[PDB]
Amino acid sequence: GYLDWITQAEDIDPRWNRFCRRKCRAAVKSNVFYWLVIF
């Protein structure tokens, strides 16, 4: 819970990469991706 917390700080603009990472990171923790991979 701490390595990703500081990683969440990297996702914030102080590049398109951080916007790319931010969208994909929340995509995994969506409660729909989990059921999709289960299916």
Partner: protein, 324 residues
């Protein structure tokens, strides 16, 4: 006596017509004085006994003895707060209740040495410090971020980066986050009549940063005046002790990481920019964990970003709800 009846409701009508009166300023109290024991007040009844470290928002100017202010608890109402002088005058009465208030002991010695209370037994003396019972505080308590290590380091700057980001989105339209790069350690409520008023003095303080240290104090003061949440995240705050005696008296948020072993692998994964001062992070937490728990205003020991965010957000709205 019909004179008291008219003046009793004179304040009642004046303070009821406009229930949207702007908050002129706020004050803090730290004296255990009971406002109900002394049956003396503009409106007779049972006055509010606001205890130590309770903020009173004085929004009206009645006279030089009692002032109208509101407290910072939920469901606050319109109350009265006597002047600090008045409190100094009435604090002197507290020692008057005893048999003697000066030097002469009453140990079976009456009628031989009267010893009336001289100027040394009054409030004229004790002027070397003469700490006032009331202290100036901003409209709302500022929030600053400390821990889990010294500020300016990789992780500590990283932990606040995600935390401050959440506040502006959740509290949009009510918050203002500012960054000040100037020192704040040397800031006391009474050090001089006019610290660094003139920069052409060419003395021990003219060339120092005190010429701009006082300027930012009003900047925080004016930020609170505009009725919005203020955030202070300077590089000069690393412990709540030094800021516990200034005029600001802010809110200290704690992000303790529980065992010191966690911090280690948190910084070890960063890169070669960290082990150049890897060891001082332990004493950075060690010199910060020894502080008594009651000094901190909130605790965030949760290991998840989301849970700690909702833990802090719930406290701020209660402060927001109370002061409205």
């Amino acid at each position: 006596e019909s004179a008291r009846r008219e003046v009793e409701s004179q304040a009642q009508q004046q303070l009821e017509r406009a229930k949207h009166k702007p908050v002129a300023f706020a004050v803090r109290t730290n004296v255990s004085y009971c406002g109900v024991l002394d049956e003396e007040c503009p409106v007779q009844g049972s006055g509010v006994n606001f205890e130590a470290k309770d903020f009173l928002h004085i929004k009206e100017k009645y006279s030089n003895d009692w002032w109208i202010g509101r407290l910072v608890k939920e469901g606050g109402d319109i109350a009265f707060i006597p002047s600090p002088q008045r409190l100094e005058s009435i604090r002197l009465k507290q020692e008057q209740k005893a048999r003697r208030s000066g030097n002469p002991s009453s140990l079976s010695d009456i009628g031989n040495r009267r010893s009336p209370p001289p100027s040394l037994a009054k409030q004229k003396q004790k002027q070397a410090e003469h700490v006032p019972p009331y202290d100036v505080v901003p409209s709302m308590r500022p929030v600053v971020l400390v821990g889990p290590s010294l500020k300016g380091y990789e992780v500590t700057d990283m932990m606040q980066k995600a935390l401050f980001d959440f506040l502006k989105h959740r509290f949009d339209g009510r918050i203002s986050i500012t960054r000040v790069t100037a020192d704040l350690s040397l800031a006391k409520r009474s050090v001089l009549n006019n610290p660094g008023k003139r920069t052409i003095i060419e003395r021990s303080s003219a060339r120092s940063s005190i010429a701009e240290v006082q300027s930012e104090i009003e900047r925080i003061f004016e930020l609170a005046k505009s009725l919005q949440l203020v955030v202070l995240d300077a590089d000069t705050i690393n412990h709540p002790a030094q800021l516990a005696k200034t005029s600001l008296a802010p809110i200290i948020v704690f992000v303790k990481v529980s065992s010191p072993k966690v911090l280690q692998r948190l910084i070890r994964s960063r890169g070669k920019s960290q082990m150049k001062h890897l060891t001082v992070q332990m004493m950075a937490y060690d010199k910060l964990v020894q502080c008594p728990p009651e000094s901190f205003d909130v605790i965030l020991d949760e290991n998840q970003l989301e849970d700690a965010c909702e833990h802090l957000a719930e406290y701020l709205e209660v402060y927001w709800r109370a002061t409205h």
